[PDB]
Amino acid sequence: TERDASNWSTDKLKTLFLAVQVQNEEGKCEVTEVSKLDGEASINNRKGKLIFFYEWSVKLNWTGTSKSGVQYKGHVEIPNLSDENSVDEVEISVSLAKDEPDTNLVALMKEEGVKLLREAMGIYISTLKTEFTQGMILPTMNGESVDPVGQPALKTEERKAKPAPSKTQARPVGVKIPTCKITLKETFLTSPEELYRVFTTQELVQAFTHAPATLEADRGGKFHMVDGNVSGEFTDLVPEKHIVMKWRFKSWPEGHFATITLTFIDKNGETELCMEGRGIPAPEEERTRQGWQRYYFEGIKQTFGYGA
């Protein structure tokens, strides 16, 4: 528990206030009488924890003479402004020269009068905490240091092998997951041969996917797109004629793909892609269809400009 040493506050702040200095008659300043910061304040710390929270106001008065030969005694008072923030930015009330032709005189006070108070804030912060606690700290360190060693770490072995599909054996996959059909028929402002590449050319995929993808145009080729959120394999790749591929979202169950089949048709100017998606999870059905054209047709149509 720390106490707000107000004794030193008024002591210096009051003096600093009753110590207002004057420059030239053009912009001179003199203190006639200063009250003291009247309010309640409290701070908490213990050698490494300085937090300031208070609410008080100060009231004083000064005099400013002008070469014109006019003297005026203004009043200054700052409400419950909190010094927790930039103390110098504290809002201070001023009422000098404004009533007399001096005016400009106060302008200097604004950069010299209230300024003097700025210094009052310096000791306020420092003196108030530069007694109860000390800001003197020393380096810290451990006599001995230790680094990671034996910890629940995972370890696996790797090997080289190149297995290929065999007619004699088969490895079917799938889970008792809901499913539906996503047949889409869209016309492309491009030739079937052109669109074919888009579905069988990575660069082109990475183009309309506006994301990183990986594509292998081969029977069993692996295609991964949309930041790899989309993955599958090519079950068939008829040159610009037809493509059968497995499809899924990275959010789909492991070993769960939708049977997708794309067909290419020359419409003498454009192409009619006949899609036939099956196995698409019912819960993901709305997603699949929506995430299709948008990233597929509607995507290509925009990226490549094959739309109508």
Residue ranges per domain, the chain? 6-130, 180-304
Which amino acid makes up residue 206? Q
**Which candidate, 59, 60, 61, 64, places its Cα nearest to that of 100?**
64
Q: Are 284 and 264 in contact (CB under 8 A)?
A: no
Per the structure block, which two tokens stand in for 243?
A: 């493509």
Q: Give residue 255's Cα distance to chain centre.
A: 37
Which amino acid makes up residue 220? G
Helix/strand/coil for 238:
strand
- The CATH code for residues 6-130 is 3.15.10.20
Q: Are 236 and 246 in contact (CB under 8 A)?
A: no
User: Nearest-5° angle of CA 228, CA 306, CA 262?
Assistant: 60
Beta bridge partners, 238, equal: 242
CA 298 → CA 169, 185, 267, 270, 308, distances in Å?
Answer: 39, 12, 19, 15, 10
Per the structure block, which two tokens stand in for 57?
A: 């106001």
Q: Are 276 and 260 in contact (CB under 8 A)?
A: yes
Count the Cβ atoms, other than its own, within 10 Å of residue 230: 22
**21: Cβ–Cβ under 8 A, 6 or more apart, which residues?**
29, 116
CA 299 → CA 146, 164, 181, 211, 290, distances in Å?
Answer: 54, 34, 21, 12, 11
Residues 221 and 188: their CA atoms lie apart, in Å, by 24
Question: Which DSSP string corresponds to 59-71?
Answer: EEEEEEE-TTS-E
CA atoms within 13 A of residue 109's CA, in its CB half-sphere: 33
Q: Are 124 and 83 in contact (CB under 8 A)?
A: yes
Residues 112 and 118: their CA atoms lie apart, in Å, by 9
Q: Which fold has domain 180-304?
A: Alpha-D-Glucose-1,6-Bisphosphate; Chain A, domain 4 (3.30.530)
| DSSP code, position 25 | G
